Amino acid sequence: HHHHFNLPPGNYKKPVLLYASNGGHFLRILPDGTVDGTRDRSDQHIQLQLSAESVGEVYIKSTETGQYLAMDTDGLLYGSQTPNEECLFLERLEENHYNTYISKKHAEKNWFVGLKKNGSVKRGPRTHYGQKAILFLVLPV
């Protein structure tokens, strides 16, 4: 293990929003595989579904398009048609309150899912522990 094992209460059954504490954007996976954020709560592409593959390990999937959130070899988030090793994230509690998502493939590099205040997602190497960008609240809809 390269990381701690504080887990959030799990939310896998229901479709959810991933709300970025850092600026209030919702994580969005567009039909063309682009990943960003939007503050438009009505957007059809911010509805996500998480599934636990192993304890503490998740897929994050678009309910609208079926795409899997993934992080590529250069640290960029993308929407994948099929589940692969780039699609698994370590779901952890952070600051006793938030959820973080670490790339499993790149766990030793501490690459996180992260949203900037301007609604663009962060590249893996530009994320790290202690940032606001990595902090999510998983909201039921």
UniProtKB/Swiss-Prot annotation:
Print the keywords alphabetically.
Answer: Acetylation, Angiogenesis, Cytoplasm, Developmental protein, Differentiation, Growth factor, Heparin-binding, Mitogen, Nucleus, Phosphoprotein, Secreted
Keyword Protease carried by entry: no
CDD domains noted in UniProt: beta-trefoil_FGF1
PROSITE patterns named in the record: HBGF_FGF (PS00247)
Outcome of mutating residue 122 to R, per the record?
No effect on LRRC59-binding
The entry marks the following residues as binding heparin, namely 22
Of the GO CC terms on this record, one is: nucleoplasm
Q: In which tissues is it expressed?
A: Predominantly expressed in kidney and brain. Detected at much lower levels in heart and skeletal muscle.
**GO BP field:** activation of protein kinase B activity; anatomical structure morphogenesis; angiogenesis; branch elongation involved in ureteric bud branching; cellular response to heat; epithelial cell proliferation; fibroblast growth factor receptor signaling pathway; lung development
Q: What is the effect of changing residue 122 to E?
A: Loss of CSNK2A-, CSNK2B- and LRRC59-binding. Reduced integrin-binding. Defective in integrin-, heparin- and FGFR1-binding, and defective in inducing FGF1 signaling, cell proliferation and cell migration
Motif extent (Nuclear localization signal): 13-16
**Places the protein is found:** Secreted; Cytoplasm; Cytoplasm, Cell cortex; Cytoplasm, Cytosol
Q: Which GO terms describe its molecular function?
A: fibroblast growth factor receptor binding; growth factor activity; heparin binding; integrin binding; S100 protein binding
Cysteine disulfide links? none
The record's section on InterPro entries has: Fibroblast_GF_fam, IL1/FGF
Provide the residue span(s) of the region labelled Heparin-binding: 116-132
Q: How is it modified after translation?
A: In the nucleus, phosphorylated by PKC/PRKCD.
Mainly localized where? secreted
What is this protein for, i.e. what is its function?
Plays an important role in the regulation of cell survival, cell division, angiogenesis, cell differentiation and cell migration. Functions as a potent mitogen in vitro. Acts as a ligand for FGFR1 and integrins. Binds to FGFR1 in the presence of heparin leading to FGFR1 dimerization and activation via sequential autophosphorylation on tyrosine residues which act as docking sites for interacting proteins, leading to the activation of several signaling cascades. Binds to integrin ITGAV:ITGB3.
Assembly, per entry? Monomer. Homodimer. Interacts with FGFR1, FGFR2, FGFR3 and FGFR4. Affinity between fibroblast growth factors (FGFs) and their receptors is increased by heparan sulfate glycosaminoglycans that function as coreceptors. Found in a complex with FGFBP1, FGF1 and FGF2. Interacts with FGFBP1. Part of a Cu(2+)-dependent multiprotein aggregate containing FGF1, S100A13 and SYT1. Interacts with SYT1. Interacts with S100A13. Interacts with LRRC59. Interacts with CSNKA, CSNKB and FIBP. While binding with LRRC59, CSNKA and FIBP seem mutually exclusive, CSNKB and FIBP may cooperatively interact with FGF1.
What family is this?
Belongs to the heparin-binding growth factors family.
User: What's the protein here called?
Assistant: Fibroblast growth factor 1
Gene name, per UniProt, is FGF1
